[PDB]
Amino acid sequence: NQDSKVVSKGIHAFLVVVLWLRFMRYYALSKNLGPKLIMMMEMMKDVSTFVFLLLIFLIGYGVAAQSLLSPDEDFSSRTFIGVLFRPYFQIYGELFLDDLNSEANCLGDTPFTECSRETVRMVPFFLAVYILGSNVLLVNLLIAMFNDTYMKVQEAAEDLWR
Amino acid sequence: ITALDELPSFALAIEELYKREAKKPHSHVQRLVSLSNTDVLGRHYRGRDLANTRAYNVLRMDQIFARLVSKDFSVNRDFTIYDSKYDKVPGIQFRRTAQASHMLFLWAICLDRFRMARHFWLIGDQSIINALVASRILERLSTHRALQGPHLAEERAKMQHNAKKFEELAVGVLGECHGSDSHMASEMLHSKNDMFNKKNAINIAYDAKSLAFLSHPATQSVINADWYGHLKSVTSFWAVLFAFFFPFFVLPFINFSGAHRLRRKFAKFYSAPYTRFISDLLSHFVLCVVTSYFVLDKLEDTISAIEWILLVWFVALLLEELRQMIFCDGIAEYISDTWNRLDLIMITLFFVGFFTHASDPSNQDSKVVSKGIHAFLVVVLWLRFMRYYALSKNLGPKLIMMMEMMKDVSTFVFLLLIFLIGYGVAAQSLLSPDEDFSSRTFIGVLFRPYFQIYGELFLDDLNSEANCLGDTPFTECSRETVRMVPFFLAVYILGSNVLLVNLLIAMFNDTYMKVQEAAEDLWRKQNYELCAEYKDRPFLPAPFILLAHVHMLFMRLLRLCGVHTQEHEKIQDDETKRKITTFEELNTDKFLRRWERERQEMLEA
Amino acid sequence: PHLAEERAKMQHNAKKFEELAVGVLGECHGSDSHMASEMLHSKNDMFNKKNAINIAYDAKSLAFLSHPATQSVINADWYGH
Numbered sequence A: 001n002q003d004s005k006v007v008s009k010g011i012h013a014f015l016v017v018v019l020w021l022r023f024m025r026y027y028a029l030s031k032n033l034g035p036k037l038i039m040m041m042e043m044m045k046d047v048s049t050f051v052f053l054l055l056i057f058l059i060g061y062g063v064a065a066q067s068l069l070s071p072d073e074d075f076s077s078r079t080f081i082g083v084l085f086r087p088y089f090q091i092y093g094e095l096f097l098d099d100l101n102s103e104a105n106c107l108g109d110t111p112f113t114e115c116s117r118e119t120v121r122m123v124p125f126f127l128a129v130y131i132l133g134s135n136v137l138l139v140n141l142l143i144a145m146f147n148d149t150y151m152k153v154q155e156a157a158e159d160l161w162r
Numbered sequence B: 001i002t003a004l005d006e007l008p009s010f011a012l013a014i015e016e017l018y019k020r021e022a023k024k025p026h027s028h029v030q031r032l033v034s035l036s037n038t039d040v041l042g043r044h045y046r047g048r049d050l051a052n053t054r055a056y057n058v059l060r061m062d063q064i065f066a067r068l069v070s071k072d073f074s075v076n077r078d079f080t081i082y083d084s085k086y087d088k089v090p091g092i093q094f095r096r097t098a099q100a101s102h103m104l105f106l107w108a109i110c111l112d113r114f115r116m117a118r119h120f121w122l123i124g125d126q127s128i129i130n131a132l133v134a135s136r137i138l139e140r141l142s143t144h145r146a147l148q149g150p151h152l153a154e155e156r157a158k159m160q161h162n163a164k165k166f167e168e169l170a171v172g173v174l175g176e177c178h179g180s181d182s183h184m185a186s187e188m189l190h191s192k193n194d195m196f197n198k199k200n201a202i203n204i205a206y207d208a209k210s211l212a213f214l215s216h217p218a219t220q221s222v223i224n225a226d227w228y229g230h231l232k233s234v235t236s237f238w239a240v241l242f243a244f245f246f247p248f249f250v251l252p253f254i255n256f257s258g259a260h261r262l263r264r265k266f267a268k269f270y271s272a273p274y275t276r277f278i279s280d281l282l283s284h285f286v287l288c289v290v291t292s293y294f295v296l297d298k299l300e301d302t303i304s305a306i307e308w309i310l311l312v313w314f315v316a317l318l319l320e321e322l323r324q325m326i327f328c329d330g331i332a333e334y335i336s337d338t339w340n341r342l343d344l345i346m347i348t349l350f351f352v353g354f355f356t357h358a359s360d361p362s363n364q365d366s367k368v369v370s371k372g373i374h375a376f377l378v379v380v381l382w383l384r385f386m387r388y389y390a391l392s393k394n395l396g397p398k399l400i401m402m403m404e405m406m407k408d409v410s411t412f413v414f415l416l417l418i419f420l421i422g423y424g425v426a427a428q429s430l431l432s433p434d435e436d437f438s439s440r441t442f443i444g445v446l447f448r449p450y451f452q453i454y455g456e457l458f459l460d461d462l463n464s465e466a467n468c469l470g471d472t473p474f475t476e477c478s479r480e481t482v483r484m485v486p487f488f489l490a491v492y493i494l495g496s497n498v499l500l501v502n503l504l505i506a507m508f509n510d511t512y513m514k515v516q517e518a519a520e521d522l523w524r525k526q527n528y529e530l531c532a533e534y535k536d537r538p539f540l541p542a543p544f545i546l547l548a549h550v551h552m553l554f555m556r557l558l559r560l561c562g563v564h565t566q567e568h569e570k571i572q573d574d575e576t577k578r579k580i581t582t583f584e585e586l587n588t589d590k591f592l593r594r595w596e597r598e599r600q601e602m603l604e605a
Numbered sequence C: 001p002h003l004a005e006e007r008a009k010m011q012h013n014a015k016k017f018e019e020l021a022v023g024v025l026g027e028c029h030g031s032d033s034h035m036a037s038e039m040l041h042s043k044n045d046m047f048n049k050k051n052a053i054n055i056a057y058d059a060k061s062l063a064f065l066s067h068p069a070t071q072s073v074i075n076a077d078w079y080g081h
């Protein structure tokens, strides 16, 4: 069965990711890599604090944005993928905008104008306050948290490397 | 008046020392009395021979000191042990020396003599509470308008120095209690002193605003013992969630603090502030999930039952908000909170969107206005879910550091608005020379420049707008001046993405390295404020809470009409209070011996 | 509570022995590195023939294991000596 080969490669992609991630366990013998691993394992609590801060902004803007661009739509799985998909990749940089202008059905030469729904041109404003809350507030709070975290536990990560 | 008739001869001696200290020129106590605006009974209603001769009576001084600690602070003095009929009672002479040492102690702060206040603090009882009250009233009395004037200059200053001395002294007696026994210190700090209207000492620290006392780990051990119902079994978040999800399968199997003993253990479990906090967190999570499933799904032509469930849910939330506003604290206390204003604007956003839905249920445009009104309720309700993160240790100082860092965020917005409005007006005027003004030119100013900071440098769309037909991306254009939009775009992304954002980075690094420890001490003050807020919470969660307000209406049936209200309080043992007082005296003598040895062991001495 | 200060100050005395142990290693690193490497590979017969760096790891002394003379002994225990 070719479908069983597709299930076998989709099961083995986890084995690829976990085996190449388990190749990082031989880096503890190096002098310049081992305290960076112990400092990353100390810094993962600040990573989890950043995930717990960003999940508020992502779930709120995703439910409000996917409800606002589709007023007249029944609930399905694809609305939940439309909540959880696009907002993320708008933090990391791809501000999908043409695709939002195509989804919004706005026919103006200006990129949010001459739309059908009059309330549909507020997706930018929520997108504007979302990228100010994500790409100018929380990520740079990580930067300040990583600087205070590394200047805290650099020598303790060195003694744990010994 | 019978209040002066019940005052003994030592109260007239302290009033004679107040009249003797007030007869000196440039005295701060006569300016304190002349700016008090109070009566001779101590009420602040603003007879003249009683207001001239007996104006320095000790009940009026104690009411001025209870006003000078806080707005809701009060003291209680009993002179009825000073009668001769109670001379055969055991310990009435010891309580007489304790009450006289407390009155001469409060006079010794009131004359700002430090060593006499140390002597009346050492011979007095309840030393930690009196040191906290002293340090608060001397730190507030140094910064007061009755002590304004140059001739009371250094008594403004150095007594404030002496105020910090009592703060350091109070911490060390707690450290001496943490030197001796943690369980006896937890029995110490849950003890309600009867002279201060039966208030525990951590509430005296919060009303006295001592952030150095509240950041101590022994006080945090007392506050985390005041979390979890004082039960030493379920302390994790997931263990309390598994105990709340399965109550019958966990609570007989859990450790203790018959059927009545298991019912008392379950009543001790559900009167915990952590259990009411995780019930309010679960009710707010079910609220945000069910309003997410409401706003993502399409509204029908009639009213749905989920809209009636949201109406009953936010009607119980509005009844709990009006019960917290009107009958609990006051309007000015409830308006000072940030999260109460966020709760009021999500009540107003739900009622505006529900009135926009229920004005015309058959119009699809009214459903579009109702979903566009309810998107604010989605954003503000999920943003109000961040207010339950203050109980976590690793999240609360990140919230106080973000609230400190928002001024640097607003400085970055005030720096970037110059570059964005200048490049937006110059760029939209330069790509469209021959165009009349409309709304779309203003959207073309305010739209594209922003998203060119965050990364999408729209460029093809600018090459399509510029009508340049070259194979090179800005060449063979119609207007010869139209190929300078790159150059303005180049100096704009150097001014935005290489100057101002990295100035934020340097501002956040200096901001976090400034106020990290102050955000930690503010998290300790918000930890006792959240524990005192959820200790006085109703035991039901939020859609049951209006029904629990109906149980408060049953308290209205105990109030005036039936008037059958029966209440009681637990009375502590006299042997346990004598053991706590002997523990306080032994820890205070051990700390003053160790602090005299540490002061003699310094290099300068 | 009555064994309070003997809880505390003996812990202070515990840190005194930790500082004392580092300095005898520093005195060995004051004298000869090869004699210190012959010292720290020696198995003491009263402690079930265990070398002293395994006594440091079972004793969890992170101040002793962060010394450069112990790291010279550990890098001599790397590469087969």
Ligand SMILES: CC(C)CCC[C@@H](C)[C@H]1CC[C@H]2[C@@H]3CC=C4C[C@@H](O)CC[C@]4(C)[C@H]3CC[C@]12C
Binding pocket: A118, A119, B352, B369, B372, B373, B376
């Ligand atoms: C300041 C905020 C937080 C308070 C609440 C404001 C909300 C409820 C108001 C303010 C401005 C309003 C919009 C103004 C104009 C229009 C055009 C109309 O054809 C459809 C509704 C729509 C799109 C309104 C929707 C609701 C709206 C967004």
Ligand SMILES: CC(C)CCC[C@@H](C)[C@H]1CC[C@H]2[C@@H]3CC=C4C[C@@H](O)CC[C@]4(C)[C@H]3CC[C@]12C
Binding pocket: A118, A119, A121, A122, A125
């Ligand atoms: C919430 C705080 C930060 C400010 C509130 C700003 C909101 C309420 C304002 C700011 C700009 C406004 C928009 C500006 C212009 C238009 C186009 C019009 O055809 C319909 C309304 C609409 C889409 C407005 C909706 C409400 C709006 C989004």
Ligand SMILES: CC(C)CCC[C@@H](C)[C@H]1CC[C@H]2[C@@H]3CC=C4C[C@@H](O)CC[C@]4(C)[C@H]3CC[C@]12C
Binding pocket: A112, A113, A121, A122, A124, A125, A128, B413, B416, B417, B420, B443, B446, B447, B450
């Ligand atoms: C310094 C920072 C805050 C710049 C300010 C950004 C704000 C004011 C800008 C950025 C993007 C803009 C939006 C872009 C597009 C549209 C659609 C249009 O049909 C109505 C106006 C509206 C909704 C704009 C309102 C103002 C807006 C939200």
Ligand SMILES: CC(C)CCC[C@@H](C)[C@H]1CC[C@H]2[C@@H]3CC=C4C[C@@H](O)CC[C@]4(C)[C@H]3CC[C@]12C
Binding pocket: B480, B481
């Ligand atoms: C150095 C700066 C700050 C001083 C002022 C320089 C300005 C006014 C000058 C310098 C170079 C000039 C450009 C040079 C050549 C052309 C091509 C011509 O077919 C149309 C005008 C145009 C596009 C000029 C516009 C004005 C211009 C931009």
Ligand SMILES: CC(C)CCC[C@@H](C)[C@H]1CC[C@H]2[C@@H]3CC=C4C[C@@H](O)CC[C@]4(C)[C@H]3CC[C@]12C
Binding pocket: B480, B481, B483, B484, B487
């Ligand atoms: C202001 C300071 C920083 C430097 C000034 C640089 C300005 C004046 C210069 C630098 C590069 C120049 C451009 C270079 C080439 C062309 C193409 C030509 O067909 C028309 C003029 C035009 C579009 C120039 C306009 C003026 C210009 C933008």
Ligand SMILES: CC(C)CCC[C@@H](C)[C@H]1CC[C@H]2[C@@H]3CC=C4C[C@@H](O)CC[C@]4(C)[C@H]3CC[C@]12C
Binding pocket: B474, B475, B483, B484, B486, B487, B490
């Ligand atoms: C290290 C940094 C400063 C690199 C320097 C960037 C400058 C010199 C570059 C970046 C992009 C460039 C522009 C890109 C496109 C055009 C359109 C063309 O018709 C005339 C030249 C002009 C206007 C260029 C002038 C020079 C320019 C502004």
